[PDB]
Design a protein around this nucleic acid. Structure first.
Lengths: 129, 150, 144
RNA sequence: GGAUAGUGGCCUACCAUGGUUUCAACGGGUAACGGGGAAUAAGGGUUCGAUUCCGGAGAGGGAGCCUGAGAAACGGCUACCACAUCCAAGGAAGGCAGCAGGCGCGCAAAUUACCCAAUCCUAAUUCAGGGAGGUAGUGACAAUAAAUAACGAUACAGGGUCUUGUAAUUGGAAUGAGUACAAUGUAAAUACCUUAACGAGGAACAAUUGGAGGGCAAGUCUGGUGCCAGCAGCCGCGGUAAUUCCAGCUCCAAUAGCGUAUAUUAAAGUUGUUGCAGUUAAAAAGCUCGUAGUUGAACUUUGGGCCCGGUUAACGGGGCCUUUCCUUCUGGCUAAACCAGGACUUUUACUUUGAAAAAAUUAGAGUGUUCAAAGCAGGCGUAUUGCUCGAAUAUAUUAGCAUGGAAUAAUAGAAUAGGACGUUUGGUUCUAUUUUGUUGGUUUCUAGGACCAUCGUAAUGAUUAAUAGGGACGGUCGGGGGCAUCAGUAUUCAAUUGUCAGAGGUGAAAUUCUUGGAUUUAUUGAAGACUAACUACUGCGAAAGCAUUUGCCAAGGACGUUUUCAUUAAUCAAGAACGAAAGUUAGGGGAUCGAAGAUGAUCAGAUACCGUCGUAGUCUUAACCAUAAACUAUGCCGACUAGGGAUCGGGUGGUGUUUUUUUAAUGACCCACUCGGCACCUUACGAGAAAUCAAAGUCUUUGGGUUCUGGGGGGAGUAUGGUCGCAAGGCUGAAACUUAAAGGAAUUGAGGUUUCCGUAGGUGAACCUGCGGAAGGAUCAUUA
């Protein structure tokens, strides 16, 4: 069954960006999916998306723009202490100056640079570069 | 896919994107409730009540018009059965295939299908006793099932 | 995917699965069974000592060849009966019968280095003095 | 209750029947004292920790006790077990896992030396004592610094008038290894630091270890030795399964150090959480159900305005309003509502910050121990009465404690309201910090709880209905299953009629029936099995598997639906249902085929190893067994990614076709879609070692959930133990030892020939045969 809707959303985004479409459709939708897409969008990795509102669970149409190499989910959401966040970056990012790993901390869902700038940590959620 | 088979069909029904009152309806809002209950004293299980209401009287679905579903209305009027619909029907099917297997011993396909049906009964009764709709054990058995169905 | 539990509360399964699979190893099994403490030719130790029981003449080919013969020795502590490898010719007349030799391994973790099968040990000392220096006429062998 | 210093089943008497466990209790092994720590440095890990510090236990092995604040003490005692000493034979006495030392064991570890001078301890005590401890002796465990040589002059080879290399060429300058007055050092010595004197010309005062086919650095080096039915013949050449057989020269790497053996760590992604593989290389359970375990759809305060406000126009912080800061109490401004003030998670997980955390060890700051390994020292002066900086700092990934946060993941709340809120009121039930002098009791008011009911106050209380799931209903569909029933020709046999010399069978023969008529032809019957053609790269079933007609019985998937519950679900150790064929125990019937057997001829060749008869079996009933190449050699669930046409089932549409005898429903076909299947052809966008693959893709850019399995080849699915079976056997399942390979995928160069799998019987064995299964076997021709 659908154990993770974020995992399927990020897989669909990866397949659309690798194959080469400009719009992709995501079913279902979630608050965590929406905030992940907002964090990916604020750095310009994707374009502009809207939330189709059926009464049941909702869908998202994302307008890609290229310049997205790879987005992924990390499962399970491991508990990440702050002094280990940078280890995770060195685990799965191409370089030390670009690429972002996504955390679900108690201040919300943010990238790791904002996580250390606000000096808070939480669980891991995924990564994008 | 199907819980006890390899089939993967998606044949279902698709509720409209409308949580109110079709414009052509204009019949009532209260008459459908006594329509429901007078169908229910006749001995009608609410699947039959719903299909009768949408086949003869134009009720699109009872929840959008009345505000409450058919379990809720029948329990509000004190007509709730001692066991729910689907558990009763599952026990009835198990009793029928148990009678068939009694009079024909060498039906191994019937034996396997009885195994699946009783496992389904066990899972559903366990759900009902998790929410404590049923008494805390209620203990589905073999012979008292046939005593239970009628 | 991948056939292993990836749950955050799924460490006991991963732990016991690694334990059983580790049992299907080679070094782990020979380490935690005490195999060097039950059935090794030595006691599982580095060197050992023994007296020379006989000197067997194994040869590579017909006698138009190189002479590579050596002794068969029982151990002192365990009493096991093995065969060794004396080094090259000129040292075969050095070793005698009942000569108190000190033995080491040969160099392939129980496998035979070179083309000599059936031997696992090489003589390090003979008559409790030396073997290499007694070759290099730097010290002589004491009598008894 | 006893006993204990004291709690306590610690023990006793009585009474209950409890307690732990698949979240591994209990039993067993440990070549197991635990921790600080050690090695290995990308991370994460892996291995070690007997051993300088902390804690425990012990004094040859059980057991007991005195004295004392403190002992179940052993450099205290008593007895038992095992060793063992003395003698006058009656008796007495023992405990080095303290320091030296010796025996034994082994690959494996030193002085029967000096002293309390330092550090500390004990005592009546500055004073005595201390094998605690220090000092020296042995000591290549481990570690630091650097000796074995440096500078000229002459002659050659150079680069070419100023720079190098070579020489049985030459010259003098410096020194410590040593030896030693002295002084220092030290408890006293030794040694170090300092130093009068002596001490360098090559066999000086001499450096070693290992290697020179590849990894891996340095021999197109030399000589000698053992052998040849190879050429010549007594000088030799070439070759030697001489794995170089050995010496000399030369070179290489490190250097007071180098090699070897064993164990372990890394490079090793061959243990894999990070981080492997499971079509064909090892490996997806025969199939489905199912408990624990692991995992599980979406949704509930979002947004905006206002300021103040920290650091480099940007990031971070807090307060107000926006229907919004909700809860539990003392005192003041007041007229249930403000302020000064005590604390809070329904119940958690998660994360930030703080504490309290032994030193030594690790990282690291300072500091010229002559550098350094170290050590925690030192530094500057009027160096004649002094001054002064230091002995920091960081980490500890679990548990307990305090705290900020409220995303993520849970969990509880109002459905018979038994719900929340009140200056709406009566009654019950209890207690009084008081005042009636204190106290005991009697009562009222009053004060604070709990309850029984009545009037209200309010938007009065139930999230979608998952292209999740189950359930209902409608019409279908299918070689799905059980029972009954029907049919078909075939085979064999029997009866009746016909007719004459053969018939069978193979490569060739022979047994065999036959002038009582074989074989064949014709009519009829009986038995048992099996369902040809139609039959498809079609259908159904969880898999094995399922093919004549009809009836009965129960089931099922896909489709359709504005039906119904609202997470009921995914995968699953335990445990269970079914499981081809062969096989076992009893009955039935036994047509055909046919393991076993009985016999024919064995002809170089059976390449063509057969023929006839034929039990068990094949079928069935009632019980067992549980395996196959049980194969898609590809777990199951969920998502996304590429074109094309067929085709099965259902549904939707067509002023389409066709059959009614009137062109009305309907059935068939055509067209366009749509859901669910069994497949098919092309391609690489991707993957692979390749064959190849729409999954074997979305994987060094490595994480959706879950179950099983593999760890180089033999030994070996063997031995042993357990369990199940009537048996055959099934499941579970080694080790010693041996091997440097083994395998997969493709291209290029005397005789029997398919390769296997499960199972039963015979056999000189690999073999031969019976039954069922597989390809891991080489598809032309016609048509559409």
């Amino acid at each position: 069954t659908r154990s993770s809707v974020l995992a399927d959303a990020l897989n669909a985004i990866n397949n659309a960006e690798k194959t080469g479409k400009r719009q992709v459709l995501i079913r279902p939708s979630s608050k965590v999916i929406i905030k992940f897409l907002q964090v990916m969008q604020k750095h310009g990795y994707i374009g502009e998306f809207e939330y189709i509102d059926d009464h049941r669970s909702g869908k998202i149409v994302v307008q890609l723009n290229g310049r997205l190499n790879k987005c992924g989910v990390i499962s399970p959401r491991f508990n990440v202490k702050i002094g280990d966040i940078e280890k995770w970056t060195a685990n799965l990012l191409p370089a030390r100056q670009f690429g972002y790993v996504i955390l679900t901390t108690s201040a919300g869902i943010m990238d790791h640079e904002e996580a250390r700038r606000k000096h808070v940590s939480g669980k891991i959620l995924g990564f994008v570069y | 896919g199907r819980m006890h088979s390899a089939g993967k069909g998606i044949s279902s029904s698709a509720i409209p994107y409308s949580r109110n009152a079709p414009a052509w309806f204009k019949l009532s809002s209260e008459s459908v409730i006594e329509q429901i209950v007078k169908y229910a004293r006749k001995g009608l299980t609410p699947s039959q009540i719903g299909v009768l209401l949408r086949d003869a009287h134009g009720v699109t679905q009872a929840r959008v018009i009345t505000g409450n579903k058919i379990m809720r209305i029948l329990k509000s009027n004190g007509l709730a059965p001692e066991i729910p619909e689907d558990l009763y029907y599952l026990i009835k099917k198990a009793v029928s295939v148990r009678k068939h297997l009694e009079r024909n011993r060498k039906d191994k396909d019937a034996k396997f299908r009885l195994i699946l049906i009783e496992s389904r009964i066990h899972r559903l009764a366990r759900y009902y006793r998790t929410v404590a709709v049923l008494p805390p054990n209620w203990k589905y058995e073999s012979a008292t099932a046939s005593a239970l169905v009628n | 995917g991948k056939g292993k539990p990836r749950g955050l509360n799924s460490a006991r399964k991963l732990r016991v699965h690694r334990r059983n699979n580790r049992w299907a190893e080679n070094n782990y099994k020979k380490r935690l069974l005490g195999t060097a403490f039950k059935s090794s030719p030595f006691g599982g130790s580095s060197h050992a000592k023994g007296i020379v029981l006989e000197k067997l003449g194994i040869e590579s080919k017909q006698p138009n060849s190189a002479i590579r013969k050596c002794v068969r020795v029982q151990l002192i502590k365990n009493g096991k009966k093995v065969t060794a490898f004396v080094p090259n010719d000129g040292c075969l007349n050095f070793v005698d019968e009942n000569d108190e030799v000190l033995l080491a391994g040969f160099g392939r973790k129980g496998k035979a280095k070179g083309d000599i099968p059936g031997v696992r040990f090489k003589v390090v000392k003979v008559s409790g003095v030396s073997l290499l220096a007694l070759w290099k006429e730097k010290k002589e062998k004491p009598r008894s």
